[PDB]
Scaffold this active site. Sequence first.
Site, mmCIF file in Angstrom:
data_model
loop_
_atom_site.group_PDB
_atom_site.id
_atom_site.type_symbol
_atom_site.label_atom_id
_atom_site.label_comp_id
_atom_site.label_asym_id
_atom_site.label_seq_id
_atom_site.Cartn_x
_atom_site.Cartn_y
_atom_site.Cartn_z
ATOM 1 N N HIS A 68 0.859 -1.209 0.000
ATOM 2 C CA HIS A 68 0.000 0.000 0.000
ATOM 3 C C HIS A 68 0.885 1.246 0.000
ATOM 4 C CE1 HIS A 68 -3.299 -2.859 1.188
ATOM 5 N NE2 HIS A 68 -3.940 -2.098 0.307
ATOM 6 N N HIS A 72 1.965 1.564 -5.809
ATOM 7 C CA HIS A 72 0.543 1.145 -5.890
ATOM 8 C C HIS A 72 -0.320 2.337 -6.318
ATOM 9 C CE1 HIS A 72 -3.309 -0.591 -4.846
ATOM 10 N NE2 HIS A 72 -3.501 0.364 -3.963
ATOM 11 N N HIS A 106 -5.608 7.619 -3.187
ATOM 12 C CA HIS A 106 -6.649 6.718 -2.636
ATOM 13 C C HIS A 106 -6.141 5.968 -1.409
ATOM 14 C CE1 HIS A 106 -4.867 3.271 -4.711
ATOM 15 N NE2 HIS A 106 -5.575 2.528 -3.877
ATOM 16 N N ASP A 107 -4.830 5.760 -1.253
ATOM 17 C CA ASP A 107 -4.294 4.999 -0.089
ATOM 18 C C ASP A 107 -3.332 5.874 0.741
ATOM 19 O OD1 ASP A 107 -5.591 2.437 0.161
ATOM 20 O OD2 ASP A 107 -4.321 1.621 -1.472
ATOM 21 N N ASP A 217 -7.887 -0.748 -8.406
ATOM 22 C CA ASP A 217 -7.239 -1.018 -7.095
ATOM 23 C C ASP A 217 -6.722 -2.462 -7.030
ATOM 24 O OD1 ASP A 217 -6.386 -0.221 -4.558
ATOM 25 O OD2 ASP A 217 -8.218 -0.862 -3.617
ATOM 26 N N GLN A 269 -5.780 -17.526 -3.469
ATOM 27 C CA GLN A 269 -5.807 -16.715 -4.711
ATOM 28 C C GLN A 269 -6.972 -17.179 -5.588
ATOM 29 O OE1 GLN A 269 -3.884 -13.842 -5.601
ATOM 30 N NE2 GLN A 269 -3.961 -14.143 -3.384
HETATM 31 C C1 KCU Z 1 -2.193 -8.562 -4.659
HETATM 32 C C2 KCU Z 1 -2.892 -9.990 -4.670
HETATM 33 C C3 KCU Z 1 -4.353 -9.948 -5.115
HETATM 34 N N1 KCU Z 1 -5.167 -9.029 -4.327
HETATM 35 N N2 KCU Z 1 -5.318 -7.733 -4.732
HETATM 36 C C4 KCU Z 1 -6.080 -7.172 -3.799
HETATM 37 C C5 KCU Z 1 -6.437 -8.124 -2.759
HETATM 38 CL CL1 KCU Z 1 -7.405 -7.957 -1.335
HETATM 39 C C6 KCU Z 1 -5.813 -9.290 -3.156
HETATM 40 C C7 KCU Z 1 -5.787 -10.602 -2.485
HETATM 41 O O1 KCU Z 1 -4.830 -11.367 -2.614
HETATM 42 N N3 KCU Z 1 -6.849 -10.864 -1.684
HETATM 43 C C8 KCU Z 1 -7.152 -12.067 -0.984
HETATM 44 C C9 KCU Z 1 -8.466 -12.329 -0.567
HETATM 45 C C10 KCU Z 1 -8.775 -13.490 0.132
HETATM 46 C C11 KCU Z 1 -7.746 -14.390 0.396
HETATM 47 N N4 KCU Z 1 -7.713 -15.610 1.055
HETATM 48 C C12 KCU Z 1 -6.425 -16.056 1.000
HETATM 49 C C13 KCU Z 1 -5.968 -17.294 1.655
HETATM 50 C C14 KCU Z 1 -4.606 -17.522 1.832
HETATM 51 C C15 KCU Z 1 -4.162 -18.640 2.519
HETATM 52 C C16 KCU Z 1 -5.068 -19.533 3.046
HETATM 53 C C17 KCU Z 1 -6.422 -19.311 2.891
HETATM 54 C C18 KCU Z 1 -6.873 -18.181 2.230
HETATM 55 N N5 KCU Z 1 -5.617 -15.200 0.385
HETATM 56 C C19 KCU Z 1 -6.437 -14.149 -0.017
HETATM 57 C C20 KCU Z 1 -6.133 -12.979 -0.707
HETATM 58 MG MG MG Z 2 -7.139 1.246 0.247
HETATM 59 ZN ZN ZN Z 3 -5.432 0.586 -2.940
#
Ligand code: KCU
Ligand code: MG
Ligand code: ZN
Length: 315
Positions: A68, A72, A106-107, A217, A269
């Site tokens: 962040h 970004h 925004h951040d 974002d 992911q």
């Molecule tokens: C930068 C990359 C992608 N990204 N952009 C914004 C945002 Cl929020 C995300 C993102 O990665 N969000 C995200 C949402 C739910 C998730 N659950 C898990 C997870 C991991 C290990 C065990 C069980 C569950 N990882 C997660 C990552």
């Molecule tokens: Mg934000």
């Molecule tokens: Zn952001």
Amino acid sequence: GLMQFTLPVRLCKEIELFHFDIGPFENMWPGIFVYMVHRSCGTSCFELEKLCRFIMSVKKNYRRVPYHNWKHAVTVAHCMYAILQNNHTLFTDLERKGLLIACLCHDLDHRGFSNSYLQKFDHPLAALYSTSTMEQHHFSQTVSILQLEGHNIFSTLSSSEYEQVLEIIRKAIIATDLALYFGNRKQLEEMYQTGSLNLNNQSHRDRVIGLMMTACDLCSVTKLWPVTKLTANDIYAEFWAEGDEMKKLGIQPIPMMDRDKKDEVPQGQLGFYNAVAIPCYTTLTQILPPTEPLLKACRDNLSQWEKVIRGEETA
Ligand SMILES: CCCn1ncc(Cl)c1C(=O)Nc1ccc2[nH]c(-c3ccccc3)nc2c1
Ligand SMILES: [Mg+2]
Ligand SMILES: [Zn+2]
């Protein structure tokens, strides 16, 4: 007008692509942002001196956190630039002005912690802003900077125009609270599929810009795989630090924030692409068809994560 920003040949071509990476040279990002402003808005939208002073004060008020951060901010602005350049007939003079600035800011002053950690920690900002805690802080920080001497980049707008553009920016920044995205996208999906969506409706415009802000974002999921994979490491570096801090409060973190669940990242992911990203770019593609390349690249990266799960790729 006669001092025009120019980029090297590769950047000049590739910046027009949705999947453009702004690269590792920090000192080039202000130039890249001004160029995108001059081309998407116009060379007279802002006084160059004030814009430059504004850009540098915004950079100073981003923190040295893994994800962040200032890079970004410019990345998110670039994704907005590509959407505005490929849908140029659909937006107003004030929206072009407001939106690249909203994306940059925004951040602002992000510390690498979720709204939920600030609540459990009982941080003062959670007392001041009970919902969209960090997002209300980002906007507040935007106003502070705009109000610094020599920083009113909107100095030529009327009082009522200045108020409209601050309201565009405020709404755009609040929309980056991903907790508001789920509702906003459901509303837009219904409006599209019943033919009630109306871009002359200001409340509908607000929702479309919100979705554009979500898309921008999350746009790391729309880059070429090597960018997408390396950026995922940066957000987990933040998530895992938060999970540590949750553990220090005596609270079990959610799985995405527990560094002991590191081997489950590919499946996390996959879950995130299916529940958030694909739906986001799918809905945006229906409303703005030229944003298709974001959806395509998001699908390609979904296949990459599946390949990781099957042990055909490493991470
Ligand atoms: C930068 C990359 C992608 N990204 N952009 C914004 C945002 Cl929020 C995300 C993102 O990665 N969000 C995200 C949402 C739910 C998730 N659950 C898990 C997870 C991991 C290990 C065990 C069980 C569950 N990882 C997660 C990552
Ligand atoms: Mg934000
Ligand atoms: Zn952001």
